[PDB]
Design a protein around this nucleic acid. Sequence first.
RNA 1: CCCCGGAGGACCACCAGUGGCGAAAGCGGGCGGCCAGAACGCGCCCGACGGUGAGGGGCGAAAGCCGGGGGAGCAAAGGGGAUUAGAUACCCCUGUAGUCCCGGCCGUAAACGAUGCGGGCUAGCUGUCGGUCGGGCUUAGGGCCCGGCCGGUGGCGAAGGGAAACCGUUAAGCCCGCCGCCUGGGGAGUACGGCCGCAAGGCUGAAACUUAAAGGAAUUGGCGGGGGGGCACCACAAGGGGUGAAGCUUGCGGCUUAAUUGGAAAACCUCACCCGGGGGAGGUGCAUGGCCGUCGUCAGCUCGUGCCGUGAGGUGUCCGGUUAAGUCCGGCAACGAGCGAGACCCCCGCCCCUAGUUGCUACCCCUCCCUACGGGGAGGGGGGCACACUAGGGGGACUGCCGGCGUAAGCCGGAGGAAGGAGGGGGCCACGGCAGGUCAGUAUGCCCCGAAACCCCGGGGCUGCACGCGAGCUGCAAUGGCGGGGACAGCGGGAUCCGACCCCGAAAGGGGGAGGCAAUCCCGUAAACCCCGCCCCAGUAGGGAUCGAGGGCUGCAACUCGCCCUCGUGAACGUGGAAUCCCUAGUAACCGCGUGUCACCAACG
Lengths: 77, 64, 194, 220
Amino acid sequence: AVRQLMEAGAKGFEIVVSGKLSTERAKFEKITYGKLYKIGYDAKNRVRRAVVHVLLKPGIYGIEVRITPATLRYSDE
Amino acid sequence: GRVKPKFIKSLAEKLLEAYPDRFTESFKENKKAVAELADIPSKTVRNKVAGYITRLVKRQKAKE
Amino acid sequence: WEPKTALGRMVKEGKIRTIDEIFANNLLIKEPEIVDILLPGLKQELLNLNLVQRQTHAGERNQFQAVVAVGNEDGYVGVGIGKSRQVRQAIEKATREAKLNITPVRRGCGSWKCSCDEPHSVPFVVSGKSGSVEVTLIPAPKGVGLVAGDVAKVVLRLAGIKDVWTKTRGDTRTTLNFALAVFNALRNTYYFKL
Amino acid sequence: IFGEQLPKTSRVEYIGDVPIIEECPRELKTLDGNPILLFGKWSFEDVVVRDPGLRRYICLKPVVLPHTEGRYQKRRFGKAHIPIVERLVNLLMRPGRNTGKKHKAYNIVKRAFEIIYYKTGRNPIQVFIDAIINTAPREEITRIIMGGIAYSVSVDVSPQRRLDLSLRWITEGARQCSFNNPKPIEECLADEIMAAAANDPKSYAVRKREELERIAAASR
RNA sequence: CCCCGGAGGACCACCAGUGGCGAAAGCGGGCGGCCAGAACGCGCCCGACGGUGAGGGGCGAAAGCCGGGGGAGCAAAGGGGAUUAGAUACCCCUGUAGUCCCGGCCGUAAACGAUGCGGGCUAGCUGUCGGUCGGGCUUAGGGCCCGGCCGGUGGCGAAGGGAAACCGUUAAGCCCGCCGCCUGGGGAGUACGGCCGCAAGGCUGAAACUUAAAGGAAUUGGCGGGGGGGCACCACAAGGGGUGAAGCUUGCGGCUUAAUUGGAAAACCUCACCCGGGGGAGGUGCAUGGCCGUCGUCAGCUCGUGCCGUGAGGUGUCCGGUUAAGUCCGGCAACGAGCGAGACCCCCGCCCCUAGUUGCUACCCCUCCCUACGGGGAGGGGGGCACACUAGGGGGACUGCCGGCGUAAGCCGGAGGAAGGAGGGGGCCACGGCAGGUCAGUAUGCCCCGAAACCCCGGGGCUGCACGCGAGCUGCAAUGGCGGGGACAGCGGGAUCCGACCCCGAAAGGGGGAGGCAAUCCCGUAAACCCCGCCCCAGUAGGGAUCGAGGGCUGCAACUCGCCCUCGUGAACGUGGAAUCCCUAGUAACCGCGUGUCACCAACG
Ligand SMILES: [Mg+2]
Ligand SMILES: [Mg+2]
Ligand SMILES: [Mg+2]
Ligand SMILES: [Mg+2]
Ligand SMILES: [Mg+2]
Ligand SMILES: [Mg+2]
Ligand SMILES: [Mg+2]
Ligand SMILES: [Mg+2]
Ligand SMILES: [Mg+2]
Ligand SMILES: [Mg+2]
Ligand SMILES: [Mg+2]
Ligand SMILES: [Mg+2]
Ligand SMILES: [Mg+2]
Ligand SMILES: [Mg+2]
Ligand SMILES: [Mg+2]
Ligand SMILES: [Mg+2]
Ligand SMILES: [Mg+2]
Ligand SMILES: [Mg+2]
Ligand SMILES: [Mg+2]
Ligand SMILES: [Mg+2]
Ligand SMILES: [Mg+2]
Ligand SMILES: [Mg+2]
Ligand SMILES: [Mg+2]
Ligand SMILES: [Mg+2]
Ligand SMILES: [Mg+2]
Ligand SMILES: [Mg+2]
Ligand SMILES: [Mg+2]
Ligand SMILES: [Mg+2]
Ligand SMILES: [Mg+2]
Ligand SMILES: [Mg+2]
Ligand SMILES: [Zn+2]
């Protein structure tokens, strides 16, 4: 489910799965990429953010995805 | 303006070296040339780049 | 692939077509792509995988330390280590360093209870050491098998050795050091003044 | 002594070797050459500041009403441009129920100036300047720790700090004299300024400066 | 304290050194005598006579013991003066053994290089000591300098070795001998036996039982009453206003209670509590999602390749300058790059353009009024978009110029400039934490209540009150109170709502009702402030708690338990202990207005 992302030419993505993924204690597993703005303008306004929770056996198990496609040339050049 | 960050000086050096003859030791001509020559969608960064190219032109004339 | 480093340029241009010529003329491999070009039949195995932590103010920051052994099963072996925040790139780094550190292994007979002239065992008695694990490899008669530990057996089989007798000293439970000492002995087969 | 040039609107009055400096232009007149009168009544022309250091920070520039908008505090040493009478007005906005009541402070100062002129026959501006000169402290003490006990030690006071201390002492003496008794604040300020000008030891400012200077002389 | 004399005991300042001698312990003034042991030089003598060494010996710091002498200084024990909760210690005064000498005993020490003794081989560079040889000089000296050998003594460091620190011709390397010692920890240097000792004690030295580690070197962090640097009005300095004391509003604690609810804009409802009657607002936020707060008025975190390491890990990311910044500039086994910083996004501020159903009034005319007679003021209408305003786009400021400083990042002063050093305010909140707060916002695991949780009803309670603590309001007065008079904003809200205007009423309030679904109508002529008159230092013409009588508003309902107005009544309080909070400019402080919650009600935001 990340080679699907490399199929696209995204310069930035960030995936966070928060919950009790292995045990009864939450862990907040997260992976990320490089040139992906985190605060300011693009993030929170022009970066594709999506939060969904999935009812598994023992919890909602939140998933937050931040993506920027190959043509999101924010003001830096 | 206190200190110019990395991207300011980097853009300054690349635009000064790609076109060494389109910049002299004045600010107005420098601002005009950088607006003509680079994709500079921000007045403040354009002004900082123009001033920094002005200072390179000053030091490059001073070195000889 | 772009043949970065001039040896890679010759290897992709086909002026060097076999891996034997590099080790015959003392050529230094700086890139793994030369190894995958010249040895398409390279098998890589994950010898060890340990979790490793650094203490900080907010808690331990864990990193996987994966040890990988690469070999052609015909007298070429190498072992590499990779530390990474996640296991996949840790294994990738270990595989790349193993491919960089691949070396030829001299083989033959030499056991007193054998007479075949095949590469099934080590040609003479060799030694290797990594920290405190000392491993002496001894030529054995054909059909005996690998008489080492498990990770040593994996490294020897990848290096293309059938029978050998081992003599170890020190804590062999340090899997990284045991693997490194066995690989060190296999590389020390080339330091013998024939 | 200087090598950093100087802002314009400043003036140098070199006598002997000493470069006396004034930050404000005394010589100012209307378009017809007439003088400008403080409150329309008092002139800024004959006033003489007897302290050479204090001459640099007393802005005796002619103004009808001493009302600068509160625009000289951004820069360090900006208080040298504020007129001295407006500084007196600004130091009357206390306690907290009188903050921002510049009209009340202006009326108090105008009445005090009239009372001063009719009781002394002198220029009210001149009497106020003499009160400041007699009230400004020339020494001070500063905290020092020898290992846990905060001792004292004599130091010098810069002329700006001397002017600030004298002005604060005059205004707080007037306020304390006026609190909780039938005497009005204008009369309290008038007698305080006249006592400060005469160097009478009864005044709050003269007592405060004498106490500070004796403490400094004790803890040199 | 100074001088002049005498007596006594210890030590041998500087020179003086990883300098010397010695087997170790140990040895530091000079002269002399008697001994000892090494190094160097040698075509001297003997001819393997050597190494190590169980057992066996001899020497062996300090303290201590036995007997004698001595005793200046210091000083266990002890006495006293302090400090402390205590102080039988640490500080001060004093003080005896002891420390010194002679004879003997003791026989121990971190008695250490924690490194047994003997011999051979294995890059070097460098300080110093002794002897000797070659050259040069000469404080003409037993002197100095350079070079070689031999022998010591330090430093760095080949090969090699090591768990690593590190050793490395003074080995902990490669070898050849002999001796001593070790075999997880505790029990335990304990018990018993023996020997030695005047004694203290010493040497030698277990097991039962108990235990799963004890331990070495190094890495990251955390911490420190170790060191250094940087920064911050949630720090200090310089200041301003305060809170802490009184009365009152309010929140938590406690007490009381049927209940005073559960957590960390209240009469019904809300509501979850109590009395009575007819799916979870039940737990676990240590199961969780999301959100949020704080670390974080931070600058940090990481990666690619390389490099050091067996490894955990380092480097880069460290040093010097620089500042908001891990911002840069210059040196480095680093060279680049990325998220955070910035940039970026709104709003304020100056200029330009476009625009004038609304908003502006210069220019006009008609009317009313006044007229010192010149003229003026007010209203309606016209004309216009000039001014102002409204809104969309653009420009402008960039250390740009100058002087100084600096390799250069960049800093200070000055001009000019609407605006000068990130122009001013705010947003966006890195990686990872705070077993941070929220199953009472929604959601969800599990575990329970199971025709019982229901946002059912009626009443009460959350409003109970000895008291503690936190945040506030209005005061103590005269820079004031009261009474008249004159003003001057900006947001913002308005639908059955805002409400002009009109009438009634002393007030609160009541009746009718234009216009406005918004630059058009309305809330809306704000208060502080200025002006004039009364009060005059007093618990008062300050203060407005408490209480009595009465009149209204909302609502189904006003007692518990609402809000407003009139008349009367006039408490504490005279500026508040220890302590403590916030704040750097249109800011603090004061003043009011709109609005959120809202049938009504704001001392709150
Ligand atoms: Mg009074
Ligand atoms: Mg011997
Ligand atoms: Mg013996
Ligand atoms: Mg002794
Ligand atoms: Mg004695
Ligand atoms: Mg004594
Ligand atoms: Mg020892
Ligand atoms: Mg060892
Ligand atoms: Mg060494
Ligand atoms: Mg023993
Ligand atoms: Mg015994
Ligand atoms: Mg540390
Ligand atoms: Mg302070
Ligand atoms: Mg109070
Ligand atoms: Mg009721
Ligand atoms: Mg370095
Ligand atoms: Mg309550
Ligand atoms: Mg009640
Ligand atoms: Mg009042
Ligand atoms: Mg108050
Ligand atoms: Mg009153
Ligand atoms: Mg108005
Ligand atoms: Mg109103
Ligand atoms: Mg009274
Ligand atoms: Mg009543
Ligand atoms: Mg009621
Ligand atoms: Mg009344
Ligand atoms: Mg009283
Ligand atoms: Mg107070
Ligand atoms: Mg409303
Ligand atoms: Zn064979």
